Structure 1
C-alpha cells in the first residue's frame, strides 16, 4: 500500500515533468534514490516509462471510456495520454427486454470485436454516468432515464467480464476531477464546481482534496428538495433541485412558457439551450427570465455551500454558461447577498475550462488511478 502511493507519486511526476531524472524524482517525491531506482526500474521493465531523463510510455496502453446518458452510450478507445484511437456512440434504448447491465456489456463486446485490431494493452474501463453512484464499489443505485436500474453492480460485472479494473464515477465528480487535474481548478485548495447539465450538482475541493474522493457517497445537492410539490425524481424523492434546474427541465419549462407567449424570439428556431442562451443575450425577456430563474436557484444553494466551505473559486460548468453574462452575475448576487461577506467578498464566479463533451472526463478517472497508484500496481503485474 505504501508501495502503491509511492509508485503513483513517482508516476505522476514522470507524467507531469518528464523528461525528468531519477535524482530529481528522489527529491520531489521525497523518496530514497534506492526507492526511486526500484520503482522506476519496474516501470521501465513494464514499458510504462521510457528513457531519453524519464518519460511516460502511453501508446502501448489503452483504456475504454464509457459515457452513458439519455438513451446513448459513448465508447472511446484511448491511450494513457488520453489520445483517441476510436470513438463510437450507440443507442441505449430506455426500455428493453434485457437488463441495462447486459445491454451495456453487449455494446462493449461489440466495440472490442469491431476495433479489436486497434487494441493495444487494455488497462481499465473508465465509466461516467448520471445517477446515484457508489464510486467505491461501482454500484449504480438509481439513475435517471432507465427507470429499471436498481443497485446495479456496474463496476463488478464489468471487472468480472473484462478482467480489467473498472473506474466508475458520476458525470459531475468526473468533471470536477478533470478540472482539478487538467482544468480551471489545478492547484486550487478550495473550489466548488457546480454543474448545470442534464444533471445538477457540485464537486467540492477542500484543503486541496476532492470531497468524498474514492468513497461510496457523493455530493448530492441536486437532490435537495426545492419544491415540496414537484415532479418525481429518480432518487425517489420529488421536487429535487435537479427536477427544476437540470437543462432538460429548464427546456420543458421554457417550452410551456413559450406556449403562452407570442412575443418571444424563442419562436424562431427549435428550442435548445443554445437558442435559449442566444435569445437571452439579445434581451428576450422570456429567455432572460428563464436563465435568471436557474441563476436564483443555483445561487441559493451555492450560497449555502459558500458559507460551509469558504472556496476561493466557483466554477460553473454548464451549457448555460453560453449565457455567462446573465447567469454568472445572478449566481454572484446570490452568493454576495446570502453568504458571509468575509467569505463572499472576493469570489469569482467563473466558467469551467472544459465543456465535458463525450468521454473526455474518463482521462481524469484513469490518470487518477495511475496517480494514486492503484491502476499502476495492477499494471505492474504484466
Structure 2
C-alpha cells in the first residue's frame, strides 16, 4: 500500500505519499523551525498535509546524522540538537501509524537503488555530495546499516591527516573537501587570488568574495567563469580520489553520485570520473566500477524513506 516519506532539510521539511513503484502522489512542505522540539510538530504537520486523501500505512523519516540499528533513535544530528532522540516513538504516538527512522543518505541510496540509477545492480555504493557528504551501501541487494546503524558515514572518513576541523568533532574528513561547503571555500580562495578571473561569479552575488554562494558557482562555471570552473575541478579531485578508495573497500558494480553538487551534470561528473580512474588502485588489472549519475534528484531520500517504511 501507500506510505509517506519525510525529508528533514536545513530549511524545509517535505513529506510525500509514495506508491509501491516509488511514485510521489502528493508533497507538502513546512518550514524547518529553529528549535528541536518544534521539528517534531513540523514533521507531524508535513505528514498530515501530504496524507490528505490517501490511505497511508506507514511513515519513513530520513534524518542527517547517526541513526541506530533499531531505526528508531537519532543518536546525533549535525544540525539539530538531537542526542539519543527517540524520534520514532514521538512520531508514532502523534500520527498513530508505524514509523521508521533512517539516515538521510541511506534513504536516498535505497531510493536510487530501487527506483533510480541502481536498478539492475546487486552491489552499489551511493554518494551524496550536498551541503554535507553522505552515502549508502547496498550489498547483495540489501541496505547495510552496520551493527549499530551507523555505517556509510562516508563524509567522516579521514582523507587529510591533521586536516580541517569538521562539524563531527574530528579532523580531515572527506566532507571538508568534497561537499558544497568545500566548493565555496575553493571559490572564495581562488576569487581572492585573482578577482579578474571571477567577474561573472562575483557579479552573480553582491560583488564581494564574502558574498559568493554555492548557487552562484554552478551558474558561473557553466558560463566558463575560470574561478568557478577551477573550483569544481578542485572538488572533483577529492570526490574522485574518495570514490577510488571506496572501490578498494567495497569493489561495487557501480557508484551512484548524487546531491546538489552533482546537479550541474557532466561539468562535475566527468572530472570526478577522470580522478576516479587516476586513483583506482590496480586499475590496469581489475574491472572498473561504473560511475553513474543519480536519477531521482532531491526526491531520492523522500522516496527511499517511504519505501524503507514498507520493509517491516
- In the superposition, the TM-score normalised over structure 1's length comes to 0.69
Aligned counterpart for 1:289 among listed residues 222, 230, 240: 230
Secondary structure of 1:356's counterpart equals: helix
Aligned counterpart for 1:356 among listed residues 294, 298, 302: 298
Q: Distance in 1 between matches of 2:286 and 2:274?
A: 10
User: What is the CA-CA distance between 1:182 and the residue it aligns to?
Assistant: 0.6
Aligned counterpart for 2:40 among listed residues 77, 95, 105: 105
- In structure 2, do the counterparts of structure 1 residues 109 and 167 end up closer, same or farther at CA, with 3 Å as the change threshold? closer
User: What is the CA-CA distance between 1:89 and the residue it aligns to?
Assistant: 2.1
* 1:299 maps to 2:233: no
5 Å-filtered alignment, 1:66-145, equals: 66-77=6-17, 82-93=23-34, 96=35, 100=36, 102-111=37-46, 118-145=52-79
RMSD: 2.9
The 8 Å contact of residues 196 and 317 in structure 1, kept in 2 or not, is answered as yes
Q: Corresponding residue for 1:335?
A: 276
Q: Distance in 1 between matches of 2:246 and 2:53?
A: 44
User: What is the CA-CA distance between 1:248 and the residue it aligns to?
Assistant: 2.9
- In structure 2, do the counterparts of structure 1 residues 344 and 152 end up closer, same or farther at CA, with 3 Å as the change threshold? farther
Instruction: Provide Cα deviations, 1:264-297, integer angstroms capped at 9, x if missing partner.
Output: 1211213454432333344332112211111111
User: What is the CA-CA distance between 1:301 and the residue it aligns to?
Assistant: 1.6
- In structure 2, do the counterparts of structure 1 residues 239 and 149 end up closer, same or farther at CA, with 3 Å as the change threshold? farther
Instruction: Provide Cα deviations, 1:61-88, integer angstroms capped at 9, x if missing partner.
Output: 5x44322121432233555664433512
- In structure 2, do the counterparts of structure 1 residues 189 and 212 end up closer, same or farther at CA, with 3 Å as the change threshold? same
Larger Rg: 1
Secondary structure of 1:367's counterpart equals: helix
Q: Distance in 2 between matches of 1:230 and 1:209?
A: 34
Instruction: Provide Cα deviations, 1:103-124, integer angstroms capped at 9, x if missing partner.
Output: 12322444567678x2544422
- In structure 2, do the counterparts of structure 1 residues 177 and 342 end up closer, same or farther at CA, with 3 Å as the change threshold? farther
- In structure 2, do the counterparts of structure 1 residues 112 and 246 end up closer, same or farther at CA, with 3 Å as the change threshold? closer
* 1:171 maps to 2:104: yes
Q: Structure 2: any 5+ residue segments left out of the alignment?
A: 206-211
Q: Corresponding residue for 1:18?
A: none
Instruction: Provide Cα deviations, 1:192-237, integer angstroms capped at 9, x if missing partner.
Output: 222101221322223333333796222112111334241331x222
Q: Corresponding residue for 1:254?
A: 187
Q: Structure 1: any 5+ residue segments left out of the alignment?
A: 1-57, 375-382
* 1:208 maps to 2:149: no
User: What is the CA-CA distance between 1:135 and the residue it aligns to?
Assistant: 5.0
Q: Corresponding residue for 1:157?
A: 90
Q: How many residues align?
A: 301
Q: Distance in 2 between matches of 1:112 and 1:207?
A: 32
Q: Corresponding residue for 2:123?
A: 190
Q: Corresponding residue for 2:307?
A: 367
User: What is the CA-CA distance between 1:176 and the residue it aligns to?
Assistant: 0.9
The 8 Å contact of residues 306 and 344 in structure 1, kept in 2 or not, is answered as no
- In the superposition, the TM-score normalised over structure 2's length comes to 0.83
User: What is the CA-CA distance between 1:181 and the residue it aligns to?
Assistant: 0.8
User: What is the CA-CA distance between 1:351 and the residue it aligns to?
Assistant: 0.8
- In structure 2, do the counterparts of structure 1 residues 192 and 76 end up closer, same or farther at CA, with 3 Å as the change threshold? closer
Q: Corresponding residue for 2:252?
A: 311
The 8 Å contact of residues 194 and 203 in structure 1, kept in 2 or not, is answered as yes
Q: Distance in 1 between matches of 2:48 and 2:294?
A: 36
Q: Distance in 2 between matches of 1:350 and 1:114?
A: 34
Aligned counterpart for 1:180 among listed residues 104, 113, 116: 113
Q: Corresponding residue for 1:26?
A: none
